[PDB]
Design a binder for this molecule. Sequence first.
Ligand SMILES: CC(C)c1cccc(C(C)C)c1O
Ligand SMILES: CC(C)c1cccc(C(C)C)c1O
Ligand SMILES: CC(C)c1cccc(C(C)C)c1O
Ligand SMILES: CC(C)c1cccc(C(C)C)c1O
Ligand SMILES: [Cl-]
Ligand SMILES: [Cl-]
Ligand SMILES: [Cl-]
Ligand SMILES: [Cl-]
Ligand SMILES: [Cl-]
Ligand SMILES: [Cl-]
Ligand SMILES: [Cl-]
Ligand code: NA
Ligand code: NA
Ligand code: NA
Ligand code: NA
Ligand code: NA
Ligand code: NA
Lengths: 311, 311, 311, 311, 311
Amino acid sequence: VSPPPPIADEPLTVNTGIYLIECYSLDDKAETFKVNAFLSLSWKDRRLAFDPVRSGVRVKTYEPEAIWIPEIRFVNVENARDADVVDISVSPDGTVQYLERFSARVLSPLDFRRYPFDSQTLHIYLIVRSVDTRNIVLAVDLEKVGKNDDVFLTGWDIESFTAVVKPANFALEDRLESKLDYQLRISRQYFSYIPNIILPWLFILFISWTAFWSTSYEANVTLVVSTLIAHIAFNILVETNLPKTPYMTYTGAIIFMIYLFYFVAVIEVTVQHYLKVESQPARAASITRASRIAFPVVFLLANIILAFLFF
Amino acid sequence: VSPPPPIADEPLTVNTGIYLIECYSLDDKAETFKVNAFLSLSWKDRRLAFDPVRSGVRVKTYEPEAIWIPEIRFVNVENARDADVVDISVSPDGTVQYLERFSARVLSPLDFRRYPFDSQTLHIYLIVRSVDTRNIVLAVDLEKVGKNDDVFLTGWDIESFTAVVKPANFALEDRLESKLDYQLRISRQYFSYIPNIILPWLFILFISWTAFWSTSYEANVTLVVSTLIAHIAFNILVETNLPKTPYMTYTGAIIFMIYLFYFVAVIEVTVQHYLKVESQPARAASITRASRIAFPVVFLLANIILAFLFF
Amino acid sequence: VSPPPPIADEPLTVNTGIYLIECYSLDDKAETFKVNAFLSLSWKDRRLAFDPVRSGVRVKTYEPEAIWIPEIRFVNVENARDADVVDISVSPDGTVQYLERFSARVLSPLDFRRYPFDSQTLHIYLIVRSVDTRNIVLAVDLEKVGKNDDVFLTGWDIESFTAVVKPANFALEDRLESKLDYQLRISRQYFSYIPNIILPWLFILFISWTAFWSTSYEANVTLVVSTLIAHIAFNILVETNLPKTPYMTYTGAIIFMIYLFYFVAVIEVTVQHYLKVESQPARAASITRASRIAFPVVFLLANIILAFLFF
Amino acid sequence: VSPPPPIADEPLTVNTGIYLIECYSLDDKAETFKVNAFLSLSWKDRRLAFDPVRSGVRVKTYEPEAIWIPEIRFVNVENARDADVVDISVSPDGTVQYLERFSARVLSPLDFRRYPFDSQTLHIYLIVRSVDTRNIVLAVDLEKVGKNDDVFLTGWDIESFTAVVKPANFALEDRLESKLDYQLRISRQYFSYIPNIILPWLFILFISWTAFWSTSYEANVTLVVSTLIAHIAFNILVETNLPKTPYMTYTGAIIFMIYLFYFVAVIEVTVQHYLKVESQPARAASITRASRIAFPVVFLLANIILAFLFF
Amino acid sequence: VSPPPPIADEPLTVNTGIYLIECYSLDDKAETFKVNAFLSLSWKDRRLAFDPVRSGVRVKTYEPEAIWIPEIRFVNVENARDADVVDISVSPDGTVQYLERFSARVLSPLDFRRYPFDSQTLHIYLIVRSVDTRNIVLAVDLEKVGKNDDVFLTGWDIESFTAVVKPANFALEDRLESKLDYQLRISRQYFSYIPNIILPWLFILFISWTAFWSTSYEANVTLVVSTLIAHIAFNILVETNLPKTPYMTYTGAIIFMIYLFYFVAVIEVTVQHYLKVESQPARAASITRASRIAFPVVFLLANIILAFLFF
Ligand SMILES: CC(C)c1cccc(C(C)C)c1O
Ligand SMILES: CC(C)c1cccc(C(C)C)c1O
Ligand SMILES: CC(C)c1cccc(C(C)C)c1O
Ligand SMILES: CC(C)c1cccc(C(C)C)c1O
Ligand SMILES: [Cl-]
Ligand SMILES: [Cl-]
Ligand SMILES: [Cl-]
Ligand SMILES: [Cl-]
Ligand SMILES: [Cl-]
Ligand SMILES: [Cl-]
Ligand SMILES: [Cl-]
Ligand code: NA
Ligand code: NA
Ligand code: NA
Ligand code: NA
Ligand code: NA
Ligand code: NA
């Protein structure tokens, strides 16, 4: 077996097509997602052409080893796909219709800048190295590109599974390579985040702000310090499900901002007490009365400023 | 090897049948379950038919490679099943009786809306792509569908393992596909949840409500704040064993409701103290006396409201 | 290759024998254990019989593919065993002596009712599906059943590795199956549990009971509440190493009982303070003086009651 | 292929030799370590002997399948080694020189009695089951036993990789087996343990002992109780990296001893307060003044007693 | 198949070349990184010479099994690489051009001394054992050494992927070995570390230092002790992502230094209170006033001293 000879000096076009059957295990920290899909391939091999009237049969079936099949690989994969050949059908003109069912862990980076309101574009790159005899070029057969209705990615909404029709043909190690981009657009389901993380956080922060309606230093310390323990607990819980980004994220910004609001609250609590011990509660109550309005107002404005900057 | 030619122009019926040997590893967060089972297949291949009189033997055994076997796959699987062919027996009329023993991690979504008092219907989808020569249609042989008595799924009660007799025949990538549904009904064992999680929770919440029989702000802060740490501990413990649902769960609802009861308790504790410092304990004791009855009554009613909305 | 023809109509007896080489990875939560062992098999195949005088050799060696070997499988396994054929020796009478070295993760349920003073009986089920030609029946060759002396299962004491000599012959999917039970009795090493978990727990509980020799509500709250945080820490630590049981466990019972002792201690602390504020320390000191004796006495008796009910 | 016939009735000696290339993943809890090494084997097969003059070549290379190779296995392995045959060279006298490169997870128990100042002797057991024709006996070729200089086991110092020259020849299932011991001596790098675990622990314990220079029960409770939370945190951190030992460990002993020092400190704090409330601070200050010296002195002596008993 | 005979008595030069396609999963604790790359190999096999006029092709293709291919292995790998042969092209002179696509988890040690401002040099060692017929020597073909632009290692900046052109030819087990070094230089992205870890637990440390503007022992204990709980939380979080180093790390040094600052702060708080109780607040306030300046100044200087010693 060797590649099919060219009629003129034109390159061999291979008609790709990925159809998602199962989409699962999107690891955010690892920036990986598992996929079980159908891989369709089609090319013209004139050596396999036959007369349908004399042969009697309209379509001829072949075993993978019997005929020449292009060596198609995935770029962004951890290991080589677990492929199972479904069918190889040859038309009278010599057009081969290959179909396999594969499974592979795909390495696709994620942008956590707008987390957990973020949307992602997952990539699946198909590639083919051109042989010495002739050059191989990939093509998208839009009829054979899609996903099944049941396909569910836990905690995400699957928008579209499209493919960049024009391949990126480039030189690599003195040989031509044709690369195709399969884009899977997904948007995060941010419902759960509000009653489970966002609201209980705010509640623990508001509990700290009750120290503005108290003159008891001992109780204020117990309030602001203990609520900070709850803050650390919640901060650790989030950053464990997120990778170390060289960029600032929307959550990371708020997370950091709350740490400042706790530090400044401690300073307030410390100042309030220092003045009361120094016998000037007129100054202490005026600062505390200001902080009653200041802390939520500045927090509300700073959040608007952040949400802007990020959205 | 090629498919058996049709008498007439009727499609090939393949008689399926799954018999569960082992059912284990139900990952709730991953929405997967592992299964070790028997897969029975039966079809008529007239090319394999023989006369039992001259042959001598009533049955004829074959190696998988020797005869045509339909390419049967599972839809909702992570990877291709680890199958081991047990037996291939051919009757004189040409009826093939295939039997294999497989193991596969099955991707079946779970509805956590009524967790941990929830029940689930696990699915196992059998599929076959129809060849060019003739169309392949799946069928359920109810005699060969079941589970062994020992089959145990830790923390669950196995109700029934049935199969939707009528296959879902549809078109996919210009070829017919016959899909069968194997339903495994299971209900959660919610015993452990009461003494381990539900009761100790309530106890830590009741401990926070002892602040209604105390006028000591320092002790009340220490009461309501520290019990909130215990609440956060138990909240994190539950939501780690559950995936991020776009829908509200029965547990999630109570979990959120307790966070409110803690926030309102802090407001009470703050108000009670503010009035005492402002020299009006008549107002403070009246609010505290009301909260002694209010907090459990509202909590008891709100739980009935939630349980009614979910069950 | 086909099964050996039966003299008269008797079933084929296959002489099994498992010899444990390595026993490791007992996952309590998963109810699984890994095993590396020897699997011996012996049957009479009269077609392989020879004369030792003319052949010169007393024993004839064969490759697995060359002769008929019975399809022996394990029932309670996650996946098919990783077997390596050690030796196949044939005697002049046609008696085949098969020996393989395998490794498989065995699914054996555990009874945590008496944890950590519990003992377990691990099972390894050998099975053989009877062919059309003749019925296959398993048998135990007690000479080839055992374990090596070095075999160590971390945190457990290996009592005995025996086998139920009489197989459980039953019908399944219109074919006979012969099932054998290999029992591995193990008892837990409960030393570590006393100084690491049992005693430090008791210490944190006794620390809470020092609130019976104190009239300071602020200090009593700090005592009983903070020690409850330590209790939650230790409770979480244990239930993470144990699966969700539909039955009550010995540990789970004590775990729950301590939660009650903490709740009742809070009620005492609350009552004591309420009476002191209400100006009646005669009633408060009398209740506290009673609780000094009551709490350890009731705890000691309730533990005897539990230990009696469980052992 | 069959074993080489004996000249006289002597057993076949196979010259073993393990050369470590990579040594990694020492799991303390699992009592396993991974190894990537060279396995050399040498035996005399007179059937393969040739004349170097007539043949023209002084050495003959063979494919594994072409010649008889002894079935060498590892005793203490999870699964069969991932071997790759490097070279098979035959000398004119029939001496075969086999060399393979393998990788296997080795099951070697560890003695945690002196942890983290403990040293371990890791074992790699080579075995061969004697065939019918003749008995196979293993031998150490010390020239082919070693490790590469780069070989690094994270957190350990590799002392020596030696082999017990005399094999342990024994009977098993009526056949002789020759077992060889390959010992890898390693000692723990206990540096990190001092500034990371040992010193911060002591610091949190000394912080608890500041309650001996205070008469404030409320502050003393806050001191001894909160520092106990830090103790529990640090105790859990260590015992998670260590398996459940039926024997007492050096760390476990100290860990338990500190729990007692916390319990006794609480009793002191409780007694001190009881006497002050009972109006006798002369008795309370005398006990507290004694405890200032008693606690560190008894702790320092008890540690010397333990270190002696263990080292 | 055997090695190609030498023209004169020169060794066989094999032209290596690694081209990284995917670089992922850098486990810091395990000191491993996964890589998906192209492995190019080129050697002259004069036996494979052909006349393109007679052959009909200028470049002849071969299956791996058909021709002699050098046994190239990786030194620092966990297991044998998952290789897939892309192309084998032979020119009329007999120059073989081998290309495979592999994936392997590479064992490369990391120096955590300057963590997280540390840079690393990852190694990939190619090796070939010389056969008895002739010696094999590796060579770098710099044209076929590189990485793709998309190659992303999460949390790291990929500097350069170079190769030490001169191989390390040495003797091992009486045979020559040619070893090549492939160096992948990477530097850590230390941005995330500042707002997520560095700043929040400078904030928790400063919160403890507010005890210098307070004379309330009860509040000071609650301050310094509770902030120490936050410190322990943050210490455990870091050392879990780092392996046990026999050397001191930059982070480990600061981590330890903060533990001292907490211990000394407790001593201050204890001394301050002892003098107040002993009726000498002039001495107590003077020490506290000094500590207000002392603690940040000493901390700032000690950090400069550490940063100088490490960088
Ligand atoms: C991860 C998620 C639950 C989360 C927590 C805290 C804050 C935010 C936003 C609102 C900034 C958030 O997205
Ligand atoms: C999921 C489970 C552990 C749980 C947590 C919280 C509340 C409930 C019910 C009782 C409302 C619950 O069952
Ligand atoms: C799980 C383990 C640490 C444990 C905790 C509590 C009680 C017990 C026995 C005595 C029932 C126990 O072994
Ligand atoms: C591990 C990392 C987040 C970290 C913790 C604490 C201190 C430092 C530097 C500032 C020394 C640090 O880099
Ligand atoms: Cl691929
Ligand atoms: Cl499948
Ligand atoms: Cl099996
Ligand atoms: Cl092995
Ligand atoms: Cl013996
Ligand atoms: Cl023998
Ligand atoms: Cl390799
Ligand atoms: Na082919
Ligand atoms: Na077939
Ligand atoms: Na066979
Ligand atoms: Na061989
Ligand atoms: Na080859
Ligand atoms: Na407190």
